[PDB]
Symmetry: C3
Amino acid sequence: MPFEIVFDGAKEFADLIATASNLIDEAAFKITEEGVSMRAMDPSRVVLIDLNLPESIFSKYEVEEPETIGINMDHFKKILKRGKSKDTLILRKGDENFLEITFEGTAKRTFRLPLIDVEELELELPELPFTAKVVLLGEVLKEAIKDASLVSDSLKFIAKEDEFTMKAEGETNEVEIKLTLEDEGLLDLEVEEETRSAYGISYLADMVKGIGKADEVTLRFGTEMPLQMDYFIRDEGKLTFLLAPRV
Amino acid sequence: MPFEIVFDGAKEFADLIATASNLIDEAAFKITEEGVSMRAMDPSRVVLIDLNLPESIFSKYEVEEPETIGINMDHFKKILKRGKSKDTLILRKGDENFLEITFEGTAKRTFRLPLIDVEELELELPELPFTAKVVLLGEVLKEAIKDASLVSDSLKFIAKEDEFTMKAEGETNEVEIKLTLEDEGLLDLEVEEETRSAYGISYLADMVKGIGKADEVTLRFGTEMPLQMDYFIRDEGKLTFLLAPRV
Amino acid sequence: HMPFEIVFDGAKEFADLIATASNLIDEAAFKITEEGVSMRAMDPSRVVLIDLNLPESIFSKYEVEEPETIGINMDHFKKILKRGKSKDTLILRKGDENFLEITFEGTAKRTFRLPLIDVEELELELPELPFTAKVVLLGEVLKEAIKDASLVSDSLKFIAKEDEFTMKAEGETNEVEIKLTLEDEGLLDLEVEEETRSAYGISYLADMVKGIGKADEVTLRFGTEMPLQMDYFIRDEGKLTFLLAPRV
């Protein structure tokens, strides 16, 4: 009654939530007339995650009573993983303290996930003076991070006007992944000035694990600045990570 | 005591035996002129299995004189798993005490499986006074059992005149799988009174583990009564489970 | 150790070939000449000899200034090569430095630096042995037969007669026989001077065939109580050969 939210393609929704539970244990979901929003940090406070799902991506969106619900992400994910690619997903909140999760397909399957109280910090998604913007295929990003992990625990990002390089170096071994606009993997490159920063590979691997090979990923960063990594859900939804630099 | 039994498609035969070995360790196979039959209980005596493979599903069927052979089901399954989807399977017994198992395909591969003797019991499949019958797609049944296992160790079956519900509840968590004749998953429903029973998920999971997503499964049960579960092999073969209810 | 540049179209195919050899050896010396690349090594137990020959004809670019031998950690080479994609171009390059540059050119340019190691080389000959039986069979049949036999025994008997090839394993109570004739799809050729019988350790056989393709044409040559020679061809021109001691 307080809200009813319907998404066509339950497995696609599960995959989106799964990306976020890779860094997050618990999260507050704010459900308004405009859409669903979520913002949280990983337990080490190194990564900020911001999820925005406008009502335009839902087949039915009815919010009688706007509110904020607390969800254990591991439990949520476990239930959503039961959804099939052709299932319709329904999120329903009654008067009681649980979220009703229904998969409608060859049958009607209804789970009750008890809501929890999550201590919500005031988290701001700041505007940052990024000097480099990179749009690249998820496949390239995911492979670069895997390549770098054979070598080191950190990955250097280097943007110049004509080339984007991700470089990792160990005691003896080294890997360099280089993209120019001549390469199929680089879809856009915008570089206000030469930009160099480094990031922990363990965090990057968790950020990209759920991203699809065909997905388009936007990176923004600055010298010794955080990395902002965005990808879009059904064109209008957006998943954003902000990753503290490595020093 | 010679016989020769030939089945087109070794992997399909492997799959069928694999379903049965999920609960059975050893089995007497009765080999007669009309077909092959097998009947056994799991080690806890909670589930009875009945397998009937009429002569009509075999491409060649030559039985000198009816006889019963005892087979270690795990060993049998291990050999049968070596068969390929396009292999012809030949089951042959000479006068010696082993089963000759041949896969004929890109090569001729012959295994020798020693026969054992099996404690054969007062095992019959009585006709119980079932009050509900449900025919449903395997994938609905398999998914409901996986869903319920997230929540509890027992699954309640509830049949009314136009709805079949499988429900499980934990301390706070609950799931309900509902089917009506409007649903693609429900192929038939016949309910002569409101019927309610519960069954152990661990046994149900082992029973359906081998069933195929598009197999048509028939369920019969009564209130506080065993569950009968069967599905057909090549239309004429039949695999039947009878499962004790849970208190 | 002069510079060279060697280019192979299809990085994943190259990785798979290297992976097959890495199943048995840990370190290998690669001889790079103007004619091609060759590698010969033994497994740590000295039961299996491996011989890899990759002529220049299978490489899309092949620039070698002077012949040289480089030592390579096969596990670290395989782990890098496993990052190549099926449509990547693979570039193996050496400069003046003592490392190998491994580049995948595809949707991006990915360059790894592999330290070269010192590999003390044994006096390894690929002897011309008087094999009395030759079998050409599909990799699918050979791989299945080794798996089948492993259900039963630790050794696999090879029996070649004029008209049939049999692989046979026996356990305490259990037994498997895999039989092929020229009427069979799995058998492409059979040439037998005299009836030939030998047996080989399945653990080695499994390691030898693990990387072989189900459609590859594998040639077997053996003799009674003699080693087994197993080879298959790469781009019809390169060749990977195993020589496996028999079980006695």
